[PDB]
Design a protein around this ligand. Structure first.
Ligand SMILES: [Cu+2]
Ligand SMILES: [Cu+2]
Ligand SMILES: [Cu+2]
Ligand SMILES: [Cu+2]
Ligand SMILES: [Cu+2]
Ligand SMILES: [Cu+2]
Ligand SMILES: [Cu+2]
Ligand SMILES: [Cu+2]
Ligand SMILES: [Cu+2]
Ligand SMILES: [Cu+2]
Ligand SMILES: [Cu+2]
Ligand SMILES: [Cu+2]
Ligand SMILES: [Cu+2]
Ligand SMILES: [Cu+2]
Ligand SMILES: [Cu+2]
Ligand SMILES: [Cu+2]
Ligand SMILES: [Cu+2]
Ligand SMILES: [Cu+2]
Ligand SMILES: [Cu+2]
Ligand SMILES: [Cu+2]
Ligand SMILES: [Cu+2]
Ligand SMILES: [Cu+2]
Ligand SMILES: [Cu+2]
Ligand SMILES: [Cu+2]
Lengths: 5, 462, 462
């Protein structure tokens, strides 16, 4: 569920 | 809301105008290359003898043609070299390349400028040199890479880098994974651009602000997986890229514990979910796969891009626990007679400089007496927008005292040889040189080094 | 059964195992490029001001894609730069290349090692330098080329060479063709190998014994012709090749007269049908087309290969005859307190060396007092089979006294800065340095220089 930048 | 990393978010590489995003390769998944340990030519308790040969060959990286590559004792990168504290070490350096090169022991406190193996230690094609030295420094992960001036960036791009592991008695007494290739592995983080026929072309990709390609390469492997056969795994991260910053985390934010930095164990273990490394930085971490089960594949990312898959196999439970203290960092006392040294990194692109000047091989820029610790205030003067400059000093392991007058980052309380300095920031280092001679300090975005953002310091016996 | 050339036939380049024969290109015939005269930014009688900019561009050499090339004040080679004995000369050096470079005034008696523009005079991308000097030497043809160490061979290959003309009162008084581009032209002799898309690729063609391609290139032109509009023509030959020797003759063995060499006019005119030149040698010749009529063509060859076609148009008959003596060679007296210096060139391929050593940038190999002429005995110690090594000394114009105890060649009684030394041969030179500092001597097969066959000499005021 989590994406970076 | 917040970045998950310690560095200043606006300065991240991904804001540069010419930023090259990583792209996932379609190349098939394959086992992570673990470079074999280099077999000594001869070893006793007191003496070890090695031959390190720079060579050209070919490596199957993508399907189709093999990539033309350089390596140490192998076609690409290098066999891992083990040194021991207090052991008299003998190395024959052999160059079988068509170009002159240099053998720089990054982070090794050996004499300069010859043994150190920077600009002033050329080895011509077909020739050999003999060096020897005894390391008196803590156990850590160092590395070897080419350092002709100019031409460092290009030679590293061809593939001339190798991990160096330094052992000591203290580290051997700690409860750490240490079975090399099984639960203790190098993770050499690089990128490349592949052109026609899977070849590299540094000059086509040249950028004075730093070369980066879209394909991640881990220990000279594309789309690597690692078979985990133990509950805990030690990873020796090395940023071996020309410019790129790595922002490392697992897909599901699996925690990991940093136990070592560039120059030593950290005094205490530091828990992380996300860790950023600038060029030449090393970080040693333990990952615990205890919540996973046979058949699971857990992936390490940089940002949104997958890098390295860990295929989980059956493993025996592991109850062991790290001590609260890993290592006693004994800070030297500053010599009170010595002033504060101010070093200023200036400019970007072609205009990069240190203290108003571009490097000159005949010119000494600074002096410092051996055995005497001095405060170095290092400033990245670039206004907004700017970049994080990794500042490296040859011939010392330094300590980090402060960042803009505040605490160092949590993983910066051990010995380091490279530190990322944010735009506008002044960092205070405690720097002592043990051995006399000539040493370089510079930015370790390698194109900046080649572009002349370097100076040299003469250390002397008083 | 006699060769027509002065050098030792067995040692000619064409006997090497990796010899690359020239081949006539299929490219269209076209007018010989005559590089324009570089316009001073400002000139008075006492001072001249110039801007010399190293730049990267593209040149249409073959049909289709343009070749990526480097040049001075142009895409390839350079604009011809005119200096005058006695005139204070100001040059701004500007580097707009992506790599650092050096601005070497080959044969110009200027201070070293900075103005000289050798290994110790880097100019980084984007920076400028200011030099000034006053030439106090005879009129002659010199040249400018890149000289970073290493990387000279590669930068010359990219196209960083330009002709430099030095004027004086004595030469102006002589009845010589001097209308630049009409009856007085550079003939810059080089070779290249074209790859995919008409590009050059030094690294693919690299050979430590000397790089040579099959395609002759004359002033940056493939398959050139020149329209002759005068009875007599002055050709200023420069061997700007990495290795290749030129063995020059016209179709029908049409005579020509050499009037000049590297460093001065010849004392007396010398008549030739066949002239051999090694790397960096220059030779100024007068060709008389008096016997030909409009519509005739005369081809200049090297060996059996056509280089340059001279197309005879209508011409006024000539107002010239050469004096029996062109120039007074004022030979200095050897300082009798000084020993004979012996310099030995050794090895081939990767093993090239001078006096048992490869070059080191911070090492001084020799010393000599300024203002004092010394005998240098220079030996090529290559057994047969060997090669002719062109030996070059920075910062001086020397005199050739003898070859194996015999007379120098007919065209070697003037001042020279480069001399071809045959296998096993000792040449005796008379060498004086006017200016203090640091100078180099080396083989001018450019791969040999980059491979470390060079040493440095420090000159001092006593
Ligand atoms: Cu942002
Ligand atoms: Cu020993
Ligand atoms: Cu030894
Ligand atoms: Cu390094
Ligand atoms: Cu280093
Ligand atoms: Cu290369
Ligand atoms: Cu995350
Ligand atoms: Cu299994
Ligand atoms: Cu300060
Ligand atoms: Cu930037
Ligand atoms: Cu930098
Ligand atoms: Cu360095
Ligand atoms: Cu023959
Ligand atoms: Cu003046
Ligand atoms: Cu000036
Ligand atoms: Cu030259
Ligand atoms: Cu020269
Ligand atoms: Cu090709
Ligand atoms: Cu003939
Ligand atoms: Cu006509
Ligand atoms: Cu040879
Ligand atoms: Cu002798
Ligand atoms: Cu030279
Ligand atoms: Cu040579």
């Amino acid at each position: 569920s989590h994406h970076h930048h």
